[PDB]
Amino acid sequence: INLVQLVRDSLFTIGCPPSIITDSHSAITISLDSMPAINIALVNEQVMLWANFDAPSDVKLQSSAYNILNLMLMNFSYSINELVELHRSDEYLQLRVVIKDDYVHDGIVFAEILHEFYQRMEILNGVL
Amino acid sequence: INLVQLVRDSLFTIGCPPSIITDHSAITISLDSMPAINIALVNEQVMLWANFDAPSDVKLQSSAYNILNLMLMNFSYSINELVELHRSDEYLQLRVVIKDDYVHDGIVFAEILHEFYQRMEILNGVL
Numbered sequence A: 001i002n003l004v005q006l007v008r009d010s011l012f013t014i015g016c017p018p019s020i021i022t023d024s025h026s027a028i029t030i031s032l033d034s035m036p037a038i039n040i041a042l043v044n045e046q047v048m049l050w051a052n053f054d055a056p057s058d059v060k061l062q063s064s065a066y067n068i069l070n071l072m073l074m075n076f077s078y079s080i081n082e083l084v085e086l087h088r089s090d091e092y093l094q095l096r097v098v099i100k101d102d103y104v105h106d107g108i109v110f111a112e113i114l115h116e117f118y119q120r121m122e123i124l125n126g127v128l
Numbered sequence B: 001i002n003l004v005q006l007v008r009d010s011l012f013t014i015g016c017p018p019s020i021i022t023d024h025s026a027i028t029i030s031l032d033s034m035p036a037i038n039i040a041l042v043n044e045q046v047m048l049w050a051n052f053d054a055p056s057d058v059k060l061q062s063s064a065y066n067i068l069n070l071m072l073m074n075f076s077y078s079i080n081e082l083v084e085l086h087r088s089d090e091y092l093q094l095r096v097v098i099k100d101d102y103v104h105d106g107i108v109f110a111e112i113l114h115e116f117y118q119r120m121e122i123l124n125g126v127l
């Protein structure tokens, strides 16, 4: 698939500004005010969305655990495993999802995917 | 992949008793005071999963930190390197899709089962 075209098409369809998009190969980024950017890229034949959050302190993670666990248990139907995945590295808590092939061919459908992913980002940002 | 042969052979190799396995499938490994380990070929990939009774909401709140730490734990044998936690009405389900490198060998696969069981033990301890 042509991911730049899919993404640009998704973003005018929902009336997003064009200035938020930055880009030959991986990856595409969408800037958001006071939020981590959404990264999009073809990763081994599948469209992948991810967001890097500054790793919370261990104490903040404990106090926010219940809320974060509820977020991670929420179904994400566009995902190959029907979940959003949370990955931890030394520096980041990374939200990650691999999108099903059925949803990467239509810019209108893909906009709803990006918007639901953003909503998940919003909830996580709220408790960090 | 002959999954029945892989599993039986994994369990001999670590001296488990043969009484604990039952069954094309899925195959169950019964363990005491705990959910069984279910194993099956699901679209060409070996999948392991364990069904835990959905905790009450208050219990989830008091165990959330321990359950979050468990899920953030690296699981190197997984395709996405995590153990996934799935919620259904009746169950909190631990799930992993095992990666090809680890499913041709009964000796290697026994270690995958053992690490998976360890993750089940940690979750059982806070539910």
Ligand SMILES: *SCC1=CC(C)(C)N(O)C1(C)C
Pocket: A014, A015, A016, A017, A030, A038, A111, A114, A115, A116, A118, A119
């Ligand atoms: S218009 C900015 C925007 C982009 C996208 C990721 C699709 N969103 O959820 C909003 C609407 C915030």
Ligand SMILES: *SCC1=CC(C)(C)N(O)C1(C)C
Pocket: B014, B015, B016, B017, B029, B037, B110, B113, B114, B115, B117, B118
């Ligand atoms: S011997 C019982 C057993 C089976 C398996 C799931 C492989 N295990 O981790 C133990 C050793 C508990």
